[PDB]
Design a protein around this ligand. Sequence first.
Ligand SMILES: CC(C)[C@H](Nc1ncnc2[nH]c(-c3ccc(=O)n(C)c3)cc12)c1ccc2c(c1)S(=O)(=O)CCC2
Length: 169
Amino acid sequence: EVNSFSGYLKLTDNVYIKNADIVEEAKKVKPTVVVNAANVYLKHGGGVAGALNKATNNAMQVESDDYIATNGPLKVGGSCVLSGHNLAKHCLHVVGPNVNKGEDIQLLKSAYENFNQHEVLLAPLLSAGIFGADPIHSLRVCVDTVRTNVYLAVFDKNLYDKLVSSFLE
Ligand SMILES: CC(C)[C@H](Nc1ncnc2[nH]c(-c3ccc(=O)n(C)c3)cc12)c1ccc2c(c1)S(=O)(=O)CCC2
């Protein structure tokens, strides 16, 4: 079965959300596209990006270093398409702003705009966690910006509940 997402809550006609680890979702679903919460040099050192790279047994990092050698770094708000390895057909590496490191929150709209080049995606909540954006704001930007079908995996039941309550106000 293709893109067999289960147990998601439909928020809008094109945005779905689940309390789940994106790595476990990718292994089960093998979506056409999994989004990585990347940085501009594609160094997958921790958090979501480190977890996805480890699930590929470091194949993602070697491919990412060869992409950077030939093409140079991404811009904040930008993206590139590389292999999905064992997790998906493709990985869309998207750079959201890191507000904790002084980057502009307005670039979160540009970051989500990359999703619109793909019909269906499994994705994390961009710029949340240690990137420092307000996660309720990130969900609002996602809902207002993405027009293709996005399945958001948020690996924290406390945050999941706060996000759904906020959306349903
Ligand atoms: C808000 C968080 C609950 C959310 N975390 C996550 N959301 C979805 N799937 C996840 N898997 C793991 C994980 C982490 C270690 C690990 O060994 N495994 C297996 C799995 C984390 C995780 C999240 C959303 C976006 C971003 C971050 C964190 S960050 O990595 O702090 C900075 C980049 C932006």
